[PDB]
Symmetry: C3
Subunit: 419 residues, 3 copies
């Protein structure tokens, strides 16, 4: 048990990258020599276990993180600064997923990965009428929506349960207040326990990434490298345009100098790049906000709220990844299930943890809400090749996630300081 | 967002009544001119959303309110006064639902509303033998009974869980006692959060009542007014006979003067009529009980327990409404599923909240336990016309609910004061 | 209600034994005279209710007791003594279920009870491949695994949830620590409430044992006495060999004298025999460990942990009972579903309560994890005759359960005292 401690205390990012490179080389070598069935028999279950462990964690996170998230965005406890930062956060997340859809429309990520995983194509499901679609957001049974997949009734019930808990917590009864407090504390404990299971699965993640993309290279060939490079280029160009366009325009409007802002926020942005965590970058972010002249009463509230709510990079990555997974199956996302991406990726970026590798878990919610279930072997085959390169996108994802919080704190402090 | 605050702070009862009258006039006018399909296309989803929001709240209330209700009726914490008021409360609720069945037998509410909502009638389900019916009260899986509809296993598991929690809370172990305390507090927090969601849905309720009974008048015609007047007459004659017969006989037996009792309890009865809430009428009820000479050690315990347990008017309304919904489909309730109404409406009146509009939610439990599921379009069509006039019956419902508590406090204080 | 208090305060073991003897005599007498259908109509539902009440309690116990059990075996809070006693406990439970399989292989319990309960035999289910079997331990939805039967995903999710809770409880955040504390306290409250429901069902248990084995004797005949005597002999010879072989060899290795150990532990072993409870024998066990010279810092930690984790007799009884139930249906347990017994009976002995009659509830988990569901009428008929004689096996079961704790405390104190 010495080698186990040698394996655990190694850096996780350098473990996943040398799992990825070794998986690519071993998969291409074994696929050139005709051993594409040996990898499917022996190596592929170790990646199937990784995909299964990531898909286990979806529904408790979607319930509990959205309960404790709507408990902080609730209008019963939201002041005057809080309404401004909530409006900023939701509008920037919606523009992030819109820019991700645009950048996944300019590039064509996945067109060329025509998937016939059992000899069959992917048949899209027929949609109900819009009245029945809007009426099935309200469940007839919330326990039945939790026991089945049904993420869209679960989101609605979680949001209204959190808002009702916050309306309970400022009651005039002591028993009612204590009961609402311990219910919210139990749901928050479940939400933190699932994040610990995410942190535990991300230690197994190098072997899973190896076993996934070795089979991807041996089965699907060599052009998947050139097709995943298009996804990486689309995500990084989308994040660069997100930062430049959105944050530089919103800082030039409110009189902030963006160049000095970036030169002040560099120490938080590089830490969010190399650590891939917004929760571990929060002391550096608060120190950077202290060094920018922002008063303590602003960034002592806007930054810990923004570390779990405002994730622009996760919403952009989920838009680009949903378009990639839909293009790999040959489907064409119609208008109407393309606005569902805009709503559901904002809700997923709210529900995302803030630990390394948590956006690929909430991508399953956006895939389920459109009509691409991961029980289908074609969707589960297209999800593996976007799960394999998640550690490359997670760094820029977390960097833009932290930069959005710093931009919102600067803008709202500039608006508040006029008095 | 000024008009939203104009809409919210308006009185809710005067909102629902002017939604109801406008819905009746607009539905009759648009149904006379042949526009019965335009209302079904455009107005009816706004009432379907209201029925769906009320049917969402059934199973968490049925679980949690019955857990925290059986935690207060439990024989591990019930003293000598408590056994007497529990016996009084259960016997008066059983006589209330029996009198509701009698008053819905004398009048014929719903005979004339022959429903053919899809060209088909309502086919009653074939019952199993009585041994299997009694054996399916105990579930093989309580989570499976919660995930499906299955209200009768859920009631049994909730009652025995509350009794086991109360037997845990007087243990000799500190850890066991603290764990039982926080489990009961979390379940009570869920039970209060669902009541807050009820209070939130009852603000949308004017638009829902409008959209429901406009389609009811346009589709089914003009004689539905004369058929709902029979239901209103049956409910109010049943409540008058409940008060007069049951409470005046039980007060004449125990030496109380009923005329002076009514003249003392008028200030609580009128408040329960106009506010439609037993929880908001509790300070007035305790003040009225203080003005009747009742000692503090009696009404400080019997009245807050009676505000959530003893609901005679809700049980009578649920009996009359179940007979109306069964008569509207053409079915005839056999003996055996007519005693199931007597048991299940008592359990529903225990599980009812005490907020305005909470008996129509627990009517779904009595409808499910008989064999009338609300997934059937005929039952969902017959439930809408009894949901539309709920604010007319809720006032007398709450009045009799408060009068039963005051009668029980007077009777048990008269029995205790002989020592 | 005087006769109810006469019935309750009677000793439960002497109630179950005189229910058993009367059931055997009445069943044989009524089966000799051809009245085997009258007992099936009138007496058999009172035993079906007992089996249903015991099968209700399976899934909440399997979830909550394993969460709070893995929260105590967790490596985040396990010291140096704790690793040694955990290794001892798990290895002794595995050897206990292995010895139970051996003793149920030497004897042939159930061969001669060929069951054709509806004219049909028992058809064994076809197993999936080993990769899919190992991959279905991780659920795609934990709420879906709880709502269905699915005990093997529930065990995995419960264990990792408990380990994540213990990794949360030593965090640096106050809110996270308090939330993990109240979540673990709520789950522990549920786990204690289900044990109170077990203690309540075991008061009805004499009538259930009567109604079960009266129908067993009237239906299946007189040779079932000779076939249950083989199960009793196999269990008691297995427990004697468990004590003698395992504990006397493990005490002779570490320099302890086993004869003086038994002469010191007699006062705890007889109390565990006659009371059938490891939780009620814990003060006597700690007093016996104090009288053996063991230091307070060892037995103040190893014995309350061993009272809920180390159950060798329950694992041996579950191995012998699973082989008996498989032999009664005519099936032959293959290798692979015979190692599943070794894993699952260890997990069931961890999850067992420590109250009288709790191993027959967790036997359902071992039956479900092999491929013998209790919804099948043949398995439900073979489970009743092993449920009828549970009070005979429970005494020696609890005796070996307490003796294992005392042996582990002595061995680990001898290992620690060398410093
Ligand atoms: C070749 C092997 C292939 C088969 C291996 C199958 C492994 C199945 C995977 C199971 C993942 C389940 C994760 C458990 C979740 C609960 C644990 C947990 O929450 O604690 C977490 C503990 O994390 C873990 O270490 C869990 C272990 C995950 C698997 C690690 C081993 C990989 C597989 C074995 C290969 C290496 C073995 C040694 C060989 C060199 C918290 O960790 P943290 O981020 O460092 O936080 C610091 C604490 N203050
Ligand atoms: C024409 C519009 C048709 C489409 C409208 C669809 C609306 C969908 C309905 C959603 C109902 C969901 C209710 C959320 C439950 C959680 C909220 C909650 O618990 O707090 C409750 C807040 O209640 C609410 O206001 C929730 C809002 C419900 C809908 C109100 C608006 C009706 C629809 C819009 C029409 C009016 C808009 C303005 C036009 C004049 C507590 O309220 P309280 O009783 O006053 O307690 C006092 C606090 N101390
Ligand atoms: C001939 C009768 C056949 C039909 C009878 C059907 C009975 C259905 C069985 C229901 C069992 C449900 C158990 C409720 C679980 C919750 C109660 C609970 O947790 O408290 C437990 C209370 O236990 C009970 O007494 C529950 C009653 C169980 C049934 C007892 C009556 C047997 C059936 C009636 C026959 C005897 C009636 C009188 C005739 C002589 C704790 O008891 P403890 O072990 O003494 O602990 C001491 C407290 N510090
Ligand atoms: C649509 C999203 C609307 C969220 C609230 C925005 C409406 C403005 C508002 O909050 O009204 C305030 C009170 O209104 C409320 O809080 C009730 C609104 C709660 C949300 C109701 C609808 C929830 C629907 C779930 C969201 C959609 C889920 C989609 C799932 C796919 C009045 O302002 P105040 O006097 O300062 O606060 C009184 C408490 N002390
Ligand atoms: C944010 C605004 C959400 C827009 C809701 C529109 C919508 O639900 O689209 C529907 C898509 O349905 C879905 O994606 C699943 C449920 C969507 C709920 C949206 C909330 C129908 O669009 P379609 O299937 O493409 O029909 C062909 C004509 N375009
Ligand atoms: C049938 C309803 C029976 C409810 C309890 C009435 C039996 C009299 C009784 O409580 O016995 C007392 C103890 O007995 C118990 O508490 C156990 C009874 C708990 C309920 C057992 C059966 C529950 C069945 C659920 C109700 C039916 C649900 C129907 C769902 C469709 C003895 O009096 P005590 O010495 O003052 O209290 C000892 C504790 N310190
Ligand atoms: C309070 C006493 C409950 C009485 C239980 C009788 C019962 O369960 O009725 C049964 C009705 O079944 C139901 O309503 C659903 C489950 C009832 C459980 C009652 C507790 C059979 O009556 P039927 O279908 O009308 O058969 C025709 C002959 N009448
Ligand atoms: C396979 C069972 C492995 C259980 C843990 C044994 C691995 C050794 C170990 O605990 O590593 C320690 C940390 O590792 C962990 O705690 C993570 C392991 C948690 C369990 C991960 C796998 C759980 C799988 C569930 C069990 C199987 C369920 C089967 C269901 C049919 C390192 O020692 P330390 O520095 O003293 O502790 C650091 C915290 N302060
Ligand atoms: C403790 C080590 C567990 C060993 C796992 C082996 C296993 O899962 O067996 C499998 C049995 O499957 C089961 O019993 C249900 C799930 C077992 C999961 C074991 C963890 C296949 O064996 P088989 O059906 O007898 O196939 C015929 C060839 N023997
Ligand atoms: N790693 C990201 C979350 C994600 O997108 O998965 C963050 O901490 O911000
Ligand atoms: N409004 C009633 C409850 C109901 O019958 O819905 C009360 O408070 O008493
Ligand atoms: N009665 C046993 C548990 C069991 O095997 O059922 C004990 O307390 O140890
Ligand atoms: Hg996933
Ligand atoms: Hg309803
Ligand atoms: Hg059982
Ligand atoms: Na944003
Ligand atoms: Na987030
Ligand atoms: Na952020
Ligand atoms: Na009553
Ligand atoms: Na009530
Ligand atoms: Na009342
Ligand atoms: Na053991
Ligand atoms: Na145990
Ligand atoms: Na033990």
């Amino acid at each position: 048990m010495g080698l186990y401690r040698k394996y655990i205390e190694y850096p996780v990012l350098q473990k996943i990258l040398i799992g990825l490179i070794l998986g690519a080389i071993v998969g291409l070598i074994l696929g050139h020599y005709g051993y594409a069935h040996a990898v499917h028999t022996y190596v592929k279950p170790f990646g199937d276990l990784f995909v299964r462990l990531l898909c286990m964690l979806v529904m408790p996170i979607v319930f509990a993180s959205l309960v404790v998230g709507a408990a902080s965005i609730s209008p019963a406890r939201l002041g005057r600064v809080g309404v401004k930062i909530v409006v900023y956060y939701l509008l920037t997340s919606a523009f992030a997923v819109t820019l991700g859809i645009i950048m996944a429309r300019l590039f064509n990520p996945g067109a060329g990965i025509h998937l016939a995983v059992g000899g069959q194509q992917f048949q899209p499901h027929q949609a109900p009428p819009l009245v029945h679609i809007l009426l099935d957001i309200v469940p007839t049974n919330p326990f039945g929506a939790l026991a089945n997949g049904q993420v869209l009734p679960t989101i609605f019930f979680a949001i209204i349960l959190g808002i009702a808990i916050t309306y309970l917590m400022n009651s005039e009864n002591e028993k009612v207040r204590k009961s609402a407090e311990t219910l919210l504390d139990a749901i928050n404990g479940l939400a933190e326990a699932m994040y610990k299971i995410v942190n535990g699965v991300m230690q197994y993640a190098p072997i899973g990434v190896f076993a996934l993309i070795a089979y991807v290279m041996a089965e699907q060939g060599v052009h998947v490298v050139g097709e995943l490079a298009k996804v990486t280029a689309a995500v990084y160009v989308g994040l660069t345009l997100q930062i430049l366009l959105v944050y530089f325009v919103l800082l030039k409007i409110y009189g902030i100098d963006p160049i000095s802002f970036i030169k002040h926020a560099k120490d938080a942005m590089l830490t969010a790049f190399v650590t891939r965590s917004s929760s571990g970058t929060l002391p550096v972010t608060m120190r950077v906000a202290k060094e920018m002249g922002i008063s303590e009463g602003i960034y002592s509230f806007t930054l810990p709220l923004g570390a779990t709510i405002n994730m622009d990079g996760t919403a952009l990555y989920q838009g680009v990844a949903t378009f990639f997974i839909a293009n790999a199956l040959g489907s064409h996302l119609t208008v109407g299930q393309q606005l569902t991406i805009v709503l559901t990726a904002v809700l997923a970026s709210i529900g995302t943890a803030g630990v390394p590798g948590a956006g690929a878990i909430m991508l399953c919610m956006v895939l389920h809400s459109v009509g691409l279930p991961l029980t289908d072997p074609n969707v589960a085959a297209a999800y593996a090749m976007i799960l394999g390169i998640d550690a490359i996108l997670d760094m820029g994802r977390t960097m833009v996630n932290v930069t959005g919080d710093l931009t919102g704190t600067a803008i709202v402090a500039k608006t508040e300081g006029t008095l």
